[PDB]
Structure formats: C-alpha cells, structure tokens
Amino acid sequence: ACVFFCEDAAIIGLAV
Amino acid sequence: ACVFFCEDAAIIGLAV
Amino acid sequence: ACVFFCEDAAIIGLAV
Amino acid sequence: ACVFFCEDAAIIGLAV
Amino acid sequence: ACVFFCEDAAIIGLAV
Amino acid sequence: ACVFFCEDAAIIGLAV
Amino acid sequence: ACVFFCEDAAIIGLAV
Amino acid sequence: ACVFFCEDAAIIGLAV
Amino acid sequence: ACVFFCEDAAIIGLAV
Amino acid sequence: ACVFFCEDAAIIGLAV
Amino acid sequence: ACVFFCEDAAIIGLAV
Amino acid sequence: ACVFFCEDAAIIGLAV
Amino acid sequence: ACVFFCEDAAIIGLAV
Amino acid sequence: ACVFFCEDAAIIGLAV
Amino acid sequence: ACVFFCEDAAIIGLAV
Amino acid sequence: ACVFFCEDAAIIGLAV
Amino acid sequence: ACVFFCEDAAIIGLAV
Amino acid sequence: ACVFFCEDAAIIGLAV
Amino acid sequence: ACVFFCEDAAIIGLAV
Amino acid sequence: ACVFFCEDAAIIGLAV
Amino acid sequence: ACVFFCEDAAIIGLAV
Amino acid sequence: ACVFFCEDAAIIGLAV
Amino acid sequence: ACVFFCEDAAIIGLAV
Amino acid sequence: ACVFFCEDAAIIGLAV
Ligand SMILES: [Cl-]
Ligand SMILES: [Cl-]
Ligand SMILES: [Cl-]
Ligand SMILES: [Cl-]
Ligand SMILES: [Cl-]
Ligand SMILES: [Cl-]
Ligand SMILES: [Cl-]
Ligand SMILES: [Cl-]
Ligand SMILES: [Cl-]
Ligand SMILES: [Cl-]
Ligand SMILES: [Cl-]
Ligand SMILES: [Cl-]
Ligand code: NA
Ligand code: NA
Ligand code: NA
Ligand code: NA
Ligand code: NA
Ligand code: NA
Ligand code: NA
Ligand code: NA
Ligand code: NA
Ligand code: NA
Ligand code: NA
Ligand code: NA
C-alpha cells in the first residue's frame, strides 16, 4: 500500500 | 479528490 | 444492460 | 500476476 | 454526446 | 456519484 | 462473469 | 500494431 | 472519426 | 512525469 | 487472441 | 503530445 | 501496493 | 484534492 | 517523474 | 491557502 | 513527550 | 522568521 | 497546540 | 502500525 | 540508530 | 541525485 | 554529520 | 540560503 496526502479541511496521509 | 488504483486481492479505484 | 462506474470510497462498476 | 475485471454485484479488478 | 458501455455478448462503447 | 465520459470540443470525465 | 478483451480486426469487450 | 478507438454508433477498438 | 488522448496539463479526448 | 485523475465536477487526467 | 494486463513492476498488455 | 497504445512483445502506452 | 502511470517515451502502469 | 511531489529541476508539492 | 511513498516492511519514497 | 500541523488527540494537517 | 506517526486508514501524529 | 507552506497549484515554503 | 517552524541559525519546531 | 525513521547504511521509513 | 521527534517548547529530532 | 530545500522568494525542493 | 536525501529508484537518507 | 539537516544528539535544521 501507499500513503497519499489528500483533503475533502484536514489534510491527512491516508494509507491506501 | 483523486482516484487511486490500489490493492491490499481486489484492485479498486478509490476516491480519495 | 450498461456498466456505470460509481462510488458511495471505492469506485465500482455497476451493471445496469 | 494479471488483472481481471469481473462481476462479484460490483464489477471490480482482481489480481491473479 | 456521451460514451456509454453496453452489451446485448460484446460490451460495446456507444456514441450517444 | 458516477463518472461519465462526454464530449464538451474535449472528451472528459464528469462526475454526477 | 468476467470481461475479456479479444480480437478475431476489432478488439471487443466480451461478457463472459 | 497499435490500437485505435474509432466509430463509424459503436466506438470500436481496432487492431491496426 | 477516432478518439485520441492528448495534452498541451490536462489529458483530454479529442475527436478526430 | 505521471498522470493523475483528480477533480475539484470534471474528472481529468493531469499530466504532472 | 486476447489482451491480458500482467506484471512481473511494469504492468503490460500481453497478447495471448 | 498524445498517448498511443501499441505492441512493441508488450502492449504499452507511448507518448508522441 | 498501487498502480501509477508515469513516463521518463513509454507511459506504463507501475506496480508500486 | 491531493498533494503530489513531482519534477519536470525543482521538485514541488502540487495541489491537484 | 514523481515521488511516491509505498510499502510491500520498509516505507520508502520511490522516484517514479 | 496554508497547511498547519496542529493537535486536535491527533496531530493532523489543516488547511487554512 | 514524543510524536509518533501511526494509523489504524489515516496516518496521524500521536503525542506520546 | 517562520516558514509556512502555502499555495495559490504549487505548495511552496514562505518565509515569514 | 500547533507546531511552527521558526529560526532566530537553527530552524526549530516549536510547540505552540 | 507506526512509521519509524531509522538507519539500516540508508535511513529509511519502517513500518511497525 | 533511529530518529525520534521529542519536546521538553522546541520539538527536536533526536539521533538515538 | 539528491533533493535540497532552498530559498529561491519561495522555499522549494531542488534536484541535484 | 548531515542527512541528505538521494537516489540512484528509492530515495534514501544518507548520513554524511 | 538552503536548509541542511545536521547533528553534532539533536538533528537540527540549519539555515545556511
Ligand atoms: Cl443495452
Ligand atoms: Cl503482484
Ligand atoms: Cl464523490
Ligand atoms: Cl472511422
Ligand atoms: Cl479470440
Ligand atoms: Cl508532455
Ligand atoms: Cl486550496
Ligand atoms: Cl521527551
Ligand atoms: Cl522567530
Ligand atoms: Cl498497516
Ligand atoms: Cl533522478
Ligand atoms: Cl555537523
Ligand atoms: Na448482462
Ligand atoms: Na444496447
Ligand atoms: Na473471439
Ligand atoms: Na472506422
Ligand atoms: Na463523430
Ligand atoms: Na493478433
Ligand atoms: Na506536550
Ligand atoms: Na531569515
Ligand atoms: Na523564535
Ligand atoms: Na527529551
Ligand atoms: Na552520526
Ligand atoms: Na553542525
């Protein structure tokens, strides 16, 4: 999996 | 948001 | 039927 | 491995 | 127009 | 929502 | 079913 | 060969 | 006509 | 560079 | 023949 | 530039 | 892992 | 939207 | 090219 | 906008 | 205290 | 002075 | 609190 | 799990 | 060694 | 190559 | 010593 | 100036 930094506001690293 | 194609197996586009 | 790509977030093909 | 696109309903990618 | 993916089998892109 | 592929010309994805 | 991409030419998505 | 996506309607992948 | 995917950066479908 | 599929709505491949 | 998308990592189309 | 999908065998995207 | 579409030219999906 | 770190050289986080 | 942070375990930035 | 890193507990990025 | 970056998937800073 | 990470889209460090 | 990155030299993360 | 940054030499992220 | 991020205030990277 | 973080003003990553 | 982030492609920290 | 990450222990960002 990879870490992405996204927002939809909090910007969080998501483990995907 | 963006679409990522990842697996952890099913490979799915995730809306992130 | 037709395939639509939708999400509610995994994007999946739905057979309509 | 190979990716297949199959109805499981949702049509998704599957890693074989 | 929009492109639809439909089957009646072959799945065909349709110019609509 | 669903993604459609439509000519607006440029053919682009559209989120509905 | 699975979608296969085959030609016999046109390359056709097949609902299998 | 290359794959082209053309319509004359159905949009067909062509093995060229 | 055929669809080509080009950019000049958004990649768009162009109807040729 | 890479192609990303994002929206902010049109979903477009961006050459980045 | 059919096209399968496989990797051993670049994912390539293989003509089977 | 445009992306083409061509057999080089492996079928790959090529930037022209 | 995820698939990314990048070029450095061939554009290929990389399993990462 | 997401932040990507790319170069085409300066490496910058792009809001996409 | 872009830097991605992935694991398959060590998590490393990959130049892709 | 700017990104701040703040404890909300979880320390997260916040877009202002 | 120390900050650790953990996830259970958002990766957050945890104050320990 | 302090460094803030802002964008108006490249995210840059700004010396304040 | 928020983390600020400031210098007066060393650039120091400050717990504010 | 948590990410640690440790010299193994190369300093890399490690998932625990 | 590992790098830890701790405060006792300044948040300091520590070579451990 | 290596990444440096330098003020050019904007502080940006630079590939050397 | 100083840490530089370099690659020859994984980007690693190098202790110099 | 450039930011360097060095230790003599604490790892300190240095404004150079
Ligand atoms: Cl139909
Ligand atoms: Cl695999
Ligand atoms: Cl949505
Ligand atoms: Cl034609
Ligand atoms: Cl056949
Ligand atoms: Cl280009
Ligand atoms: Cl913004
Ligand atoms: Cl402490
Ligand atoms: Cl200050
Ligand atoms: Cl995990
Ligand atoms: Cl390089
Ligand atoms: Cl030193
Ligand atoms: Na059917
Ligand atoms: Na039909
Ligand atoms: Na056939
Ligand atoms: Na034709
Ligand atoms: Na037409
Ligand atoms: Na053939
Ligand atoms: Na504290
Ligand atoms: Na200064
Ligand atoms: Na200060
Ligand atoms: Na301490
Ligand atoms: Na040392
Ligand atoms: Na020093």
Note whether I7 contacts L: Cβ–Cβ < 8 A: yes
Which partners does chain E have (≥3 C-beta pairs < 8 Å)? C, F, G, H
Beta bridge partners of C10: B14
Taking a 5 Å cut-off on Cβ, the residues next to ion ligand 3 are F 1
Note whether M1 contacts J: Cβ–Cβ < 8 A: no
Q: How far apart are CA D7 and CA D10, in angstroms?
A: 5
Contact O2, O16 (CB under 8 A): yes
Contact V14, X11 (CB under 8 A): no
Q: Report the sign of the C-alpha dihedral through residues K9, B16, F2, D9, in that order.
A: positive
**How many residues in chain M?**
16
The label of the residue with tokens 């993916």 reads: E5
Q: Which two tokens stand for residue T8?
A: 């193994």
- The CA H9 to ligand 5 mean position distance, Å, reads 23
Note whether F15 contacts C: Cβ–Cβ < 8 A: no
Q: Which two tokens stand for residue R8?
A: 């108006």
- The CA R14 to ligand 24 mean position distance, Å, reads 24
In this complex, do J12 and F14 lie within 8 Å of one another by their Cβ atoms?
no
Which partners does chain W have (≥3 C-beta pairs < 8 Å)? O, T, V, X
| Antiparallel, parallel or unpaired: β D2-7 and K2-7 | antiparallel
Q: Report the sign of the C-alpha dihedral through residues D10, D14, E4, E9, in that order.
A: negative
Residue P8 DSSP symbol: -
Burial class of residue U8, CB neighbours in 10 A (0-12, 13-18, 19+): exposed
Count of CB atoms within 10 A of residue S16's CB? 10
Q: Strand locations in K1-16, DSSP E? A: 2-7, 10-15
Contact O11, A3 (CB under 8 A): yes
Q: How far apart are CA U4 and CA T7, in angstroms?
A: 12
3-class state of residue N8 by DSSP: coil
For residue K14, which ligand has an atom nearest its CA?
18
- The CA M14 to ligand 1 mean position distance, Å, reads 34
Q: Report the sign of the C-alpha dihedral through residues I2, G1, B7, G6, in that order.
A: negative
Q: How far apart are CA S11 and CA R3, in angstroms?
A: 9
